[PDB]
């Protein structure tokens, strides 16, 4: 039957402005295998994103890792956009990072 994807976003290293890092989007638990996943920078699609080979778990649900090398700045906001036959609309999961304390 059909299964909706679980979407989990994470960076390889702690967020540090000006330091190169890796943004990851692990999409798993979905069926069928046709899916479109995009990494977003300030709402704009990031080009030349790599993804691992399609695989599946013991329960036959598929999973994929999308990733790209990136350098965050203070204003930038990153997220993962996934569309699938189980979704009414593309689901967007943000990369949650701290920007330090708010007040100076």
């Amino acid at each position: 039957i059909q299964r909706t994807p679980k979407i989990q976003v994470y960076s390889r290293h702690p967020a540090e402005n000006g330091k190169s890092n890796f943004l990851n989007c692990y999409v798993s638990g979905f069926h069928p295998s046709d899916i479109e996943v995009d990494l977003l920078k300030n709402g704009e699609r990031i080009e030349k994103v790599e993804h691992s080979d399609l695989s599946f778990s013991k329960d036959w649900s598929f999973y994929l890792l999308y990733y790209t090398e990136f350098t965050p700045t203070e204003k930038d906001e990153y997220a993962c956009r996934v569309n699938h036959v189980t979704l009414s609309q593309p689901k967007i999961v943000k990369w949650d990072r701290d920007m330090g304390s708010l007040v100076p």
């Binding site: 039957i1 989990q8 994470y10 290293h13 990851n24 069926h31 069928p32 080979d53 036959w60 949650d96």
Partner: protein, 270 residues
């Protein structure tokens, strides 16, 4: 513990996609090239102790995939296979051996001792599929020898050649952040752990020596460099976030746990 996965998506009678890959324990080691029709070796120790045997392994897999796709196309209507459908197969070994096939992501048939047996839930359509798969007993004997004999020879050439890879110890790094903040008056404390290998890891929020049993450990997620990632979250009231720390235990640290403290701009201090 080597196993091979096989993904075949049948969009219609004249369009398809085929993805194949081999795995040692949890490390991907081989990939099939549909255009080149050859086995690609992800790592130098993926060739094993076999030299050139690979040409037969390729053409054997080439023939058996040619028969599979044409056989599925021929018997699709007889098997009540409705486009678009997907067939997944995983076959492997360990003392153990397995070969299972799924239709539309559900258990359909499995290869037991010397023949394909249907999963009783999959109904008469799986029994008819086993009739086609069990047409030639010599083909099933070849499948039996691949699982019981050919695979242990494959692990012999792979596990010994790449033992330094699976047993390597890579130290984790960790950091702290605020979570999406569930509930008014509460905070979500997030402890990230990335870059560690192998997979077993220990992470807990602490108040001194007292493990905080509210620690919600996420899934261990893969990283493209071969290491792993994990988030462990603790939800606390805004006032009682004092003297909290994240402690990470890992085999690579040799007892030198990583300890991070909810401190500084995280609190935030004055």
């Amino acid at each position: 513990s080597f196993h091979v996965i096989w993904i075949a998506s049948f969009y219609n009678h004249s369009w398809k996609q085929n993805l194949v890959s081999g795995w040692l324990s949890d490390l991907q080691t081989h990939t099939w090239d549909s255009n080149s029709s050859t086995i690609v070796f992800l790592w130098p120790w993926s060739r094993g102790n076999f030299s050139n045997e690979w040409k037969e392994l390729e053409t054997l897999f080439r023939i058996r995939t040619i028969r599979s796709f044409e056989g599925i196309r021929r018997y699709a209507h007889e098997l009540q296979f409705e486009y678009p459908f997907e067939i997944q197969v995983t076959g492997g070994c360990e003392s153990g051996s397995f070969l299972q096939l799924a239709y539309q992501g559900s258990d359909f048939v499995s290869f037991q001792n010397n023949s394909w047996l249907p999963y009783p839930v999959a109904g008469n359509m799986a029994k008819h599929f086993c009739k086609v798969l069990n047409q030639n007993q010599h083909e099933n004997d070849i499948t039996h020898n691949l699982l019981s004999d050919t695979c242990p020879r494959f692990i012999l050439g792979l596990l010994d050649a790449g033992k330094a890879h699976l047993q390597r110890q890579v130290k984790p790094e960790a950091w702290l952040s605020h979570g999406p903040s569930p509930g008014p008056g509460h905070l979500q404390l997030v402890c990230h752990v990335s870059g560690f290998y192998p997979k077993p890891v220990w992470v807990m929020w602490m108040r001194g020596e007292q493990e905080q049993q509210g620690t919600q450990r996420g899934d261990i997620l893969p990283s493209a460099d071969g290491t792993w990632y994990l988030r462990a979250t603790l939800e606390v009231a805004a006032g009682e976030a004092a003297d909290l720390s994240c402690r990470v235990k890992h085999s690579s640290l040799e007892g030198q746990d990583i300890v991070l403290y909810w401190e500084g701009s995280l609190v935030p201090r004055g």
